Amino acid sequence: QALDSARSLTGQLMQFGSTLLGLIERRDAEAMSELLQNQAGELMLSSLR
Amino acid sequence: DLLRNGGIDKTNTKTLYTTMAPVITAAMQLDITESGEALLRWLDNNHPAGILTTSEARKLIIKKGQTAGDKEKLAAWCQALAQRVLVIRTFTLSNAELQTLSQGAPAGTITELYNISDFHNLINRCGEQAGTVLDALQSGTLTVKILAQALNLSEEVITQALTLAGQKPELTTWAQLAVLPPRLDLADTLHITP
Amino acid sequence: YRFYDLTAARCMMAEKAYAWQTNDTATRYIKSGAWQSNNAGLMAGESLL
Amino acid sequence: YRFYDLTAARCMMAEKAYAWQTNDTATRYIKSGAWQSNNAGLMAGESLLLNLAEMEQAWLKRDSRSLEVTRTVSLAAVYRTDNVTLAEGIADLLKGNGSGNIPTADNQLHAAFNLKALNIKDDYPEALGTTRRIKQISV
Amino acid sequence: GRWLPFEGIPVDDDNSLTLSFPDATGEKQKPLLLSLTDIIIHIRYTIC
Amino acid sequence: GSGNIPTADNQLHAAFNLKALNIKDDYPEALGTTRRIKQISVTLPALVEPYQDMRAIFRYGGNSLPAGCKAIALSHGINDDGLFRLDFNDGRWLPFEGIPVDDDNSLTLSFPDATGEKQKPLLLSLTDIIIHIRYTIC
């Protein structure tokens, strides 16, 4: 029964780990997508220039 | 609020950083929680006077009722944090450079932002092998052989560039590496050895 | 991070209940290295489980 | 949004059941800040469930066996302490008197006994345990 | 899962032990309550 | 009055070393090399007054168990474990579980208030203490 209680918490820890990896990679996706846009802006500046 | 609730940041050191750093990084939009762990250490090691050590910041965030005073003190602490993040972001120094500078790189006047930029320059020169340079510098085994192999120059140029304001045999601190880039650039712009 | 703290304690409780229900204390199964700071502790649940 | 309202109430119910099953009310585990409006309340479940796991592991450490005792209290004895013992204290009560706040009050009988006067702590040594709580009562 | 009646009560104080008997007047209950020679109660408690 | 018992101070106390109980000699060694306690029930066949409990603590001398497994209570004195319900399926251990039958226990069977009171006639009329130790040979 101690084993089952720990196995339940380890399953929940795995769920946290999956969600955390998802959020990490998703935040890094948003940061890149914003970097690309900032670059496109400071590049259209030279294009207009 | 996110620091006040949640798990009480543990009193023992080297855990205060690791327990405060994820949310600190989230508030500073740093790259890595480990860069956040190192930024607090850096601002702890050298800071403008009157700004709270991270221990005092924890003891002040966990208080019964945060007074009118000792809350602008915490605002000043977080402003110092933001200023340090700015120093990191204007030089775009990597997590490893950050971790090297965390153990006492004075910053806050131009005479010292210069040496920060010089160190950063030397590390960017090291390039794909800067991990090894900064690791052997974090330990006590940074030798001119590995530094030259990393910079793709000879030992017989670096042991000479050290001699100007000489600290030749013991490469122990990052401050000794910020001396290189000026001497190297000079001995490159005049085709001579240092 | 502060959930892995509970999970490792549960796995240790389970190991102790194992050692007390079977008198084999020399052996140990819940081993360290489940949390690696290189990976911000990701896949701690996998190792623990 | 209106589901997090039920979830926080359940976590609070669980904290109260924890405080009643273990007489540790000073401590508290389900803490606020689980819902942040910056994030439209996203990852409220993660915080609440971390709190629930903190509380469950506190419970798993505080839980153990426990000494459990029955005490047969023949109320005729504690009535003899009043010298007005039940045998003749019950039959003589014959009247249609009405009186609330009993400790044949109004139309019904009522006994009342203070467990402090029952000397339960004196039944066992203090080195066994500092707390003693009722579990079940049979008459 | 539900608690038992009178569970968790500390044995220290704060209870007048109410044992009510509705309609203790003259009826079929009166002979019973007169013939009740004693009330015996079994309190199960726990020492943690 | 006297602490460190094995009417000590104001209570009675028995103490018995399971090494002196010769449990390994009860069965051959070819059956199993280990033997551990599982459950302990006590029987006190005494002249008891009607509607009267009997305060008695049965306790483990050593310290290798969980928190409360080392101590047990008693109610009346006939095949009464310190529990109310006797169910093995409960996840919790039974009191005095896992104890090896070898040594390291003065078998504490305390009797609070062995002085002159309603308990004195009971304890004098107790002609014998009979205990039932359930153990397991793996």
* 3-state DSSP assignment of residue B28: helix
3-state secondary structure (DSSP) of residue E45: strand
Of E16, E40, E43, the CB nearest to D134: E43
Could you tell me if C15 and C25 are in contact, meaning their C-beta atoms sit under 8 angstroms apart? no
CB contact under 8 A, C10 and D57: yes
CB-closest option in F51, F68, F73 to E40: F51
CB contact (8 A) between residue D134 and residue E37: no
Contacting residues of B for C2, CB less than 8 Å apart: 6-7, 19
If we measure between CA atoms, which residue out of B132, B134, B172 comes closest to residue B149?
B132
SS3 D113: coil
User: Are C3 and A24 a contacting pair at CB < 8 A?
Assistant: no
The two three-digit tokens of residue B82, written as one number:
């933001």
Contacts of E18 (CB under 8 A, 6+ apart): D102, D103, D110, D111, D112
Q: Does E38 touch chain F (CB under 8 A)?
A: yes
Residues 6+ apart with CB under 8 A from D4: D34, D35, D41, D44
* Amino acid at site E45: Y
In contact, F79 and F39? CB cutoff 8 Å = no
Taking the CB of residue B44, how many other CB atoms lie within 10 A of it? 19
Distance from CA of C23 to the nearest CA of F (A): 9
- What is the H or E stretch that residue B161 is in? helix B155-163
Strand runs labelled E in F46-125: 56-59, 71-74, 108-111
In 3D, which of E37, C13, B136, C16 has the Cα closest to residue D88?
Answer: E37
Give, in degrees to the nearest 5, the angle at Cα D65 between D64 and D71: 140
DSSP-H helix ranges across B4-94 = 16-28, 33-45, 54-61, 72-91
**What's the full length of chain A, in residues?**
49
Q: Give the method of determination.
A: cryo-EM
**φ/ψ (deg, to 5) at C19:** -65, -25
D90 in Cβ contact with E30 (< 8 Å): no
Q: Which residues contact F123 (CB under 8 A, 6 or more apart)?
A: F12, F46, F111, F114
Which residues does chain D have within 8 Å of residue C10's beta carbon, measured at their own beta carbons?
Answer: 57, 60
D70's enclosing H/E stretch is: strand D67-74
**What are the φ/ψ torsions at residue B68 (nearest 5 degrees)?**
-60, -50
Q: Which residues of D73-96 are buried (b: 16+ CB within 10 A; e: fewer)?
A: bbbbebbeeeeebbeeebeeeeee
CB proximity under 8 Å: C 10-29 to F: 20-21, 23
Establish if F88 touches chain E: CB-CB under 8 angstroms. Answer: no
For residue B108, give every residue at least 6 positions away whose Cβ sits within 8 Å of its Cβ, in sequence order, or none. B46, B48
**How far is residue E46 from each of residues D22, D66, E43, F82, measured CA to CA in Å?**
12, 6, 10, 11
Using CB atoms within 10 Å of the CB of residue F23, give its burial: 0 to 12 exposed, 13 to 18 middle, 19+ buried.
middle
Resolution, angstroms, 1 dp: 3.2
Q: Which of D88, D132, D138 to mutate to test the interface with E (most CBs of E within 10 A)?
A: D132
* Chain C residues lying within 8 Å of D56, measured CB to CB: 6
